[model samples]
Target: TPEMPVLENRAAQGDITAPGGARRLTGDQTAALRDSLSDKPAKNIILLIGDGMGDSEITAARNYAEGAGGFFKGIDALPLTGQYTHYALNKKTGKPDYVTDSAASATAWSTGVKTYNGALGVDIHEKDHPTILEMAKAAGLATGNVSTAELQGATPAALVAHVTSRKCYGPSATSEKCPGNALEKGGKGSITEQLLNARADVTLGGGAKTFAETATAGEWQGKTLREQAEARGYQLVSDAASLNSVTEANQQKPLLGLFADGNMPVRWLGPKATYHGNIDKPAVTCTPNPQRNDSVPTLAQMTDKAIELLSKNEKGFFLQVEGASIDKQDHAANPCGQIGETVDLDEAVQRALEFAKKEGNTLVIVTADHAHASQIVAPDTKAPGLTQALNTKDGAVMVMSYGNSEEDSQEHTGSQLRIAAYGPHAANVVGLTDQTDLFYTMKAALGLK
Candidate 1:
């Protein structure tokens, strides 16, 4: 698809303003919101994150869905809604930093403590903190981490591993030396090593390169992490076919599905295929590619499989499903790709909601870790010759633009994000809330003390 038009000099069109308009709850309103929550603990907890999904991204996805002959779905129908301020404390200063990257924000959600940027499941003090997943595992509940990005990516890693820096995914930590400020490397292994040893029952995502055996010989010369996992009784699956073959009969076995060498293909970029006249084509085209579609599993598919397996645990389960590329595409200023990824995430949310409704004891929370610079604007009102017009049927176009120019860094913005929830304790996520509150709320909902 042609690149979406960049609104030149958005500042001239309108003043760039901070995101506002959070509704404050009265004392009675607060009591009612609290009263609506269930004191009884939930049997299952599903946390769904659209990485870098702010309010505007949700709006963009809704618009794209409507334009494509579909109505707003999934998250739009959530029962309770609220907003969260996503800020991380600087490790050195011990105060809130205006903007936060995925690692820091996710760490806040996973551990209920703010940490420096790029820190995994550690606090600013660089001490390893127990994560919700670890707690779940300790309580005899099943746990899983599913993502569109690498399983060791910031968001997923925060759930399972603890490292001073998020970049420590590897077969050998010695080969990839850590910075001086990073955690002391006694006998504590790399994040990849931690992930393999972690108590998570199921891990499905991309980043096979990090876990696969390297061609070189070294301390990691023998079996790859994949092989090691299999030896430890995990059902290794690498493609859609294998993933689909995982039936409920054998779902109790530990499962690990790494679908790509790196991050999986974006929703729009499917497998390479040939055109009508036998013309070989690239997978990155705008048109649908069936070959690619059959190869990789969608976010929703992975989520369904995760729930299927984790639900077998009678003690309950905690499953985290991430739509990772929304932030990545936004960083590269690709509106079309970001929109496609967001829509894909929405589908995953829909699946979680369906499961929650039927199961009744499950708590589902759909939210974002941070916000990107992407924004939406009304159709340009300038003269036709002066500006390129989007070819809308009614000429009412919704242009997507970055708040700042792409030449400048497309870094994350310090903005409040929306949170939606259903099932037990869903009402606790009402009115203005802090990102750290998610940890406490989930802990309370699960009766984790």
Candidate 2:
């Protein structure tokens, strides 16, 4: 079968300044484009989310790492591309909050409902909703949740737990910030505890520190979450070698890989964008983060192994993978930091594409949970806000500015984001759609009730 095309404009290939040089169309693409459209129900769905990966972040990453004229082999390969609005419900007014945080944005897709910022699998009114993963597993499909962020990070937690606040990672946080939902008070336990209850076939990522906390009041009271998980029959693996040796993951022995105490380390590193004198420094390329080592699995590695493990189910699978620290880097005003995570995400997308393309029945989607506060600005323009200049793969100096806040961390932005996909029902993402609409589209694609 002739596959849908990736980015046609390779770097240094076209006279980009010429009239038709940047054009992606070779001839009439109508019939060929039509070939990519179908409503066939997907036997499996792989949803890849890039936290804070707005259009600007995507373009900046491309310009810095792939050159301005180049496109990502995986992120840009999806034929059906469109924009989707992501706004969460204001907790008090019930009106739109305009800018969404990861938890609310994730819930919009995971549970098909709008929620307040910091909410997990719950609506704006604190009403519980079942996530897509829960329903898929209930229907006998296998499922996996993978992320570079902690396992209890909002993006991954949205698929497995319902809590009043994203901060409720362990019993302590729940006891403090979300008392009503705390374990001692007889609620659904903490996010980490709930995640253990809603065990996916495969769960991989960081946040091992939360597991060290003891359960407050439950069947396993006084026991550490790490001990509780083992008592409940999880096959815990902390390193890549151990993860690779595992042959199977299921209800009897679901795989749980926790790689770091917190969120996994970002792949790339550089100086944070300083407001005053950052542009004065010579433009530099990104260097690999010393913290990222062989012990931890890369996003692509986790995605590849997840597909391998989850796809063995006869009923199919639903897997969500997140390249999380793009937002974290953006908040810290680190241009190289975000770019490297974006590239790392691109590789994860590539892994998912490989599996989906080969299996021919999997739906693969790549999109952002929310937009962030990074803008590509003119180089050395003498900016006042957080700014930095970096030498790019195009042999050019690129400057990025961050003005989302005066505080230490930048803020999420109020903007629509790029949404692209391939495989069964991929065309559903074409044209404008709300973030919550994804739930229905994916549900239909997977034939889920």
Candidate 3:
């Protein structure tokens, strides 16, 4: 008998584009396509990068939110999954930095080059590079940059600005500078200016305090930015109430929505009732003490509104939505908060998947810019043959162990991250991959070649 050839595991191999439902494309071919598409144009590109998301953190998040051995509802709902590689070449050592900072990580996706931490929209040497948004706009596609962070923050800034440092605040032309109440300055314009001037369609998420001096009570900033946006033909909105109105408003122009002065509160921050045991006698429904108003619109709602506006363009559009707070919560070392925000992110994924289903031509890419801290999942080890439930931090018997670190404020430990995808090129994103490859993957998926 002839010797049989061995096959690699699909999960490990991660090559789903072969013949039949399973075929193979050589590394050379895949690499060739990635390189060839470097200059090609894509009709629509939707990049969703969860900054600082680690595998352990995501696992912990998934397990905690839906019980042990539970799936990450948001990402699991996707049609595809891929492994992501996250390492950056150190500027001085030239060695791979196992854990990357958001600034440099973002540049990898925005510009295909791995730069130092705190650098935004620039190549490794701190040179200006065209962002994915710039490329899409130049190709005549409508572009949208949305996040839960300040509108001018790093992730959002990547789309409109090219700077050497992500921390340089205040209005400036060359850095991630905010113009405060002003929108214009010489030939260089503020980020808001670039967004509006480029006619970038659909700018949403919090940042009103800085832009609107007369922001409605509880709002964030000055009013000049909003006024400028309105003057540039943008439909300005400030609250959930306004969001609803704008969605239905018959506007032929773009929209600018600012819901909070800063990053919106974590979805898990508000008060909620949880019942244990029968309600007939007495049930424990612990209410949080004076919960803050994190009542911002859900990511799903925002995604719907963006699709509505961007879909109007006949030339097609490019949209980038960030689950910005997942990374933030991780940096804060709040597991519960991180999980809740991830659920929100999952909701955003569901939204994108829904839109892609209706619009066949659209291409959606879901990934994290880099992995965050240890989201550890401990193995079950106890003196029992078979047990149905386990005790968690709250004295409740659950399927997995839950951490009790509500008071800690530190970065998380290193762990793997999860990336899921669906639609046109979605199948291509599954399995393990380097973070930088995401840029090439998105470019290839959009038919950029």
For every candidate, C-alpha RMSD to the true structure in Å? 9.9, 1.5, 10.0
The list of candidate 2 runs beyond 4 A from truth reads 1-13, 17-19, 276-278
Tens-digit lDDT track of model 2 for 333-381: 8898899999999999998888887788888999998899999888757
User: Which 10-residue span in candidate 2 carries the lowest summed lDDT?
Assistant: 4-13
Candidate 1 residues 271-381, lDDT tens each?
A: 211111112221122333344467799999999988998888788889999999999877766655677788888899889988887787788899999988776644432
What TM-score, computed on C-alpha atoms, does each candidate reach? Answer: 0.81, 0.97, 0.71
Where model 3 places Cα greater than 4 Å from the true spot, the runs are: 1-43, 92-95, 172-199, 212-223, 247-252, 270-295, 377-409, 412-416
Candidate 3 lDDT by residue in tens digits, 349-435: 767766765565566667777766433423332311111222333344332222333344334333446676545555556667766
Q: Which candidate tops lDDT?
A: 2
Backbone clash tally for model 1? Answer: 1
Compared with the true structure, the alpha-carbon lDDT of candidate 3 equals 0.58
Best-fitting candidate, scored by TM-score:
2
At residue 106, what lDDT does model 1 achieve? 94
Alpha-carbon shift of residue 381 in model 1 (angstroms): 7.3
